[PDB]
Amino acid sequence: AGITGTWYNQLGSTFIVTAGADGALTGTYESGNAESRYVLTGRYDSAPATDGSGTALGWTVAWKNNYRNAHSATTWSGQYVGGAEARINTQWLXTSGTTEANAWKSTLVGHDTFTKVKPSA
Amino acid sequence: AGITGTWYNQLGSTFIVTAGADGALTGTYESNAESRYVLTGRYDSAPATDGSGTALGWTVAWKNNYRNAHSATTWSGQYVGGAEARINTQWLXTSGTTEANAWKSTLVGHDTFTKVKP
Amino acid sequence: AEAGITGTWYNQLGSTFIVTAGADGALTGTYESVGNAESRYVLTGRYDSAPATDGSGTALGWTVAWKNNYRNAHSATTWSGQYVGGAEARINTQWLXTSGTTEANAWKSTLVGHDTFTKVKP
Amino acid sequence: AGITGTWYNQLGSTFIVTAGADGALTGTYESAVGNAESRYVLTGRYDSAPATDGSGTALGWTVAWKNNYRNAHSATTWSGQYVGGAEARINTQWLXTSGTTEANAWKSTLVGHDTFTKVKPS
């Protein structure tokens, strides 16, 4: 509950997601041209605690579509926090395909927060 | 592609995955049915053939019909083919927390998977 | 030349740290969760003392081991980040906290997160 | 021995460290990869009174990648623990942040993991 919808991060990328009754996340991630749209899939806790805790979840986008392939994939891990203004707070890992000699620089890390409203600025 | 099949991490877990032609990863992660969980993810279905690995990632939410830890792990990494084939990953586990505890919500670590047991 | 880093920084959760940025690249100071002694710990780290002039941030990092004369949590946090100058100067960081664990519990030894520090006590 | 000594990671970097009585780590880091040549200063902290229940010893340190030869405008922190034994090891995860503009801040930080032994691998 509450997860399905369109979400926007602080840099205005758009995460359109559906949360299925089974725990599945499915949808699209973009930033508005078709060439910038990618499939996403993930999982979320479909029976969260009832004590005030958020709902754990995660998803992946591989950065290949019909138009572009960056040979890389990002995973977001986080929790949905419901209520007045719902947010999803995440930290993410992007791994690029590398040779073994370059594997030490394969993975970037950062954090994104998503709300159902587009950001200002 | 080389990803579909059974993989083992270095600490007794088994990752059973099918890599679909559409770039999907689907499968299960275990350890016994009480210890088994659905996973889903995505991978680069057209990687480079220049010696670079194949990027990928997937998620397990730690709920099944028996147990629920109210947490989810994501793995981000690359498959490296060859005679000693491996999937090398870094992972983040986020637990559901209150706002006050959100600073201790996420563990980070790494896992290497191989096609034969440890 | 002024690095702009020396002084008192606050995150959005209470915590305060007081740092000196030495001419040799050193960061030295204290980190405190209110300001009582039992909440104060030694900080040490390093920063780039000749950053780029193209508008990029100044890379830096520091460590606090969570032991003082009063308490010992058997853990240490590192913050890795960059200072961004201006009227609203900020240090944006990602941090890792590692707790000492047995080998069996080593998978749950390290937490990760992010914090942003400003010069304005919130 | 303990933490003080010369350690090597899996990629052949050399970490020369002294663990002081007061919890200080000091020494030099020499990296086999990246925009890096010769030694760089490191400083950090460690738990100088660890648990006696078989846990490892929490520690962390930072290198800013500027020395008299090269400046990569970046810094790495390592957070981890020392695990004594027959083959003593320091297991860490690390974050490198590069100075970036605001537009590029999303790609400022790499993450990885290093394990160090007192014996050098090939």
Curated annotation (Swiss-Prot), chain A:
- Where is it mostly found? secreted
Q: Does the keyword Secreted apply?
A: yes
One annotated GO molecular function is: biotin binding
Where in or outside the cell it occurs: the entry states: Secreted
Motif Cell attachment site: where? 43-45
Q: Which GO terms describe its cellular component?
A: extracellular region
Domain Avidin-like: from-to ranges: 1-119
Q: What does this protein do?
A: The biological function of streptavidin is not known. Forms a strong non-covalent specific complex with biotin (one molecule of biotin per subunit of streptavidin).
Per UniProt, subunit arrangement is: Homotetramer.
Its recorded name reads: Streptavidin
Which organism is this protein's natural source? Streptomyces avidinii
